[model samples]
Target: VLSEGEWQLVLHVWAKVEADVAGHGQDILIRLFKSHPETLEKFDRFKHLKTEAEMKASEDLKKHGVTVLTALGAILKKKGHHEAELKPLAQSHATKHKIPIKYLEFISEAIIHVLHSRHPGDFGADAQGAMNKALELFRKDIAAKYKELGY
Candidate 1:
């Protein structure tokens, strides 16, 4: 639940970066892999890529990254109103991919990191707080769905 001001900030930052969603999204993934290498084991398609450069060059990685960022863009557009839209995605991660909740948490953090890095001056404490609240809401909803499906 972000405040009205916070929501505005999120939207503003998103507007600044949305044009390069693919690059930003892939960079977040790369950061996640660098910080938590074990997370790579969950991705059958990505696990074989041994380096960040390789991962960045991967078409699959780029496409999935863009898809993820696009989904985030949709969530931001609704001001976090349509979280239910994420249920199917959560279910797939839980059931089909067997992705743990921790990986989702990591991804959330990675997104935040990318936002901060991309907008160093603009993404201040207030912005971070808002993003964190919004992201937490998303993470909680997705985690709840993951648990609901008996994963």
Candidate 2:
């Protein structure tokens, strides 16, 4: 279980990540949740059932060993210090969960999707860069927090 602060941070960072990546974040999350129905319980938003493309993407993510689902949970756990989130939860479910950085980078793609949903604008080249900077700052904060804990 993640602390309220950490959970909020996950959502905050996740939102920025979604903005930077285009629409892929929502798609990946939508697909991941659909495949692992049990994971749905981890999120406050309990919407499962993905479209056909989402199912295929979930399989593709599984094949690549890129379990964004678990990575999300792990990030939430690390940040929140609570029960579980997408990344950590998925890690618990899978036998071969990858390291943190690799999965975070992969999961960042979904950030673009999140931004699109939140900020509907004519984002230009600067949009991605701006989001990148924000994410970097968010990463720095998370790193600092972890470092305080000897992470």
Candidate 3:
């Protein structure tokens, strides 16, 4: 759970993220794939983006980015019901989607990195810290579910 102050910081950061969800999500993913190229292979649709230019031009990337942002939006907004947002995602990714656990860590870093770099003015240390805590909370949730699911 986010502390009261931490939740406020996340709201500050999310104002920027929600304003341009598409751009934020795509930029995060684009930068993520640059860092972990093989991670893109996890997405059948995105695995084909061979170069930076191609990734920028990719409609599918932008579309999927919207999906990712929407999921995160739900996670942030659901308050005590965060499990509702994560449970299906954990189950599907762990079983149906067949994703690796390590990739989630990359995303935790990538999301904060993108936001911190892009909005240095808005993201003070506390805000960054809050974002990290939130992602860490969510990351651990999915990873734990994976263990119980025998993934």
* Candidate 1 worst ten-residue window by lDDT: 79-88
Put down candidate 3 lDDT per residue, 1-151, tens digits, no spaces: 7888888788777878888999998999998999998788888888878999999999889989999989988897664358778999999999988888888899889999999888998898989898888888888889899999998
Clashing pairs in 3: none
Which candidate achieves the best lDDT against the true structure? 3
Alpha carbon lDDT of residue 48, candidate 2? 46
All candidates' lDDT scores?
0.85, 0.45, 0.87
Best by TM-score: 3
* Residue runs of model 2 more than 4 Å from their true location after superposition: 1-25, 28-101, 113-121
Q: Each model's TM-score?
A: 0.92, 0.36, 0.95
lDDT string, candidate 1, 1-151, tens digits: 6678988988888888787988898898899998899898888878999987798789889888888889877877887677567877887888898888888889889988998998898799888888888888888888788778887
Each candidate: RMSD: 1.4, 11.0, 1.2
TM-score of 1: 0.92
Q: After superposition, how far is residue 64 of candidate 2 from its true place, in Å?
A: 22
